[PDB]
Amino acid sequence: MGTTISKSGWEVLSFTTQEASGEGAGNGLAKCLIDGDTETFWHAKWQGGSDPLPYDIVIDMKQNIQIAQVELLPRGRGSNNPIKVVEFAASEDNVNWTPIGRFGFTNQDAALEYYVKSIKARYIRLTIPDDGGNSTVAAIRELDVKGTIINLEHHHHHH
């Protein structure tokens, strides 16, 4: 809300891993990452076994937004989080992904502000690479995006 894009209408198009069993039920879901609540978080599958890295989570923002900065809200508090490096990708057509920034992940209780490549994107992908040293254990509260809302809707020319 405000400069941060309202994740109210955001949905997950594809996810590589999510723990809907180890975290009970209603928690550890990939959509919780974009649900926008500090008490909910996404967790990689651990109960019964993890999935093959890397982990790619693709979110549809349902609108074209000029990406400027991505925010990652980790847990930290009572969490290990063996996440070393995180990679952010964005796309205008869902087909052509462009890495808006690759940075290291700092496990903390406060949000991580990632200033990235300024580019238009309707879709955004969170990539957890197997290259950065990342283990198959990941727990992130939420992901947010700061940008400018772009419109493809010209009401006086589209009705």
Automatic annotation (TrEMBL):
Positions of Zn(2+) binding: 32, 35, 37, 40, 141-142
Residues reported to bind Mn(2+): 32, 35, 37, 40, 141-142
Domain F5/8 type C as annotated: residue spans: 2-148
Protein name: Chitobiase
Native source species: Bacteroides thetaiotaomicron (strain ATCC 29148 / DSM 2079 / JCM 5827 / CCUG 10774 / NCTC 10582 / VPI-5482 / E50)
Residues of the full protein shown: 291 to 440 of 440
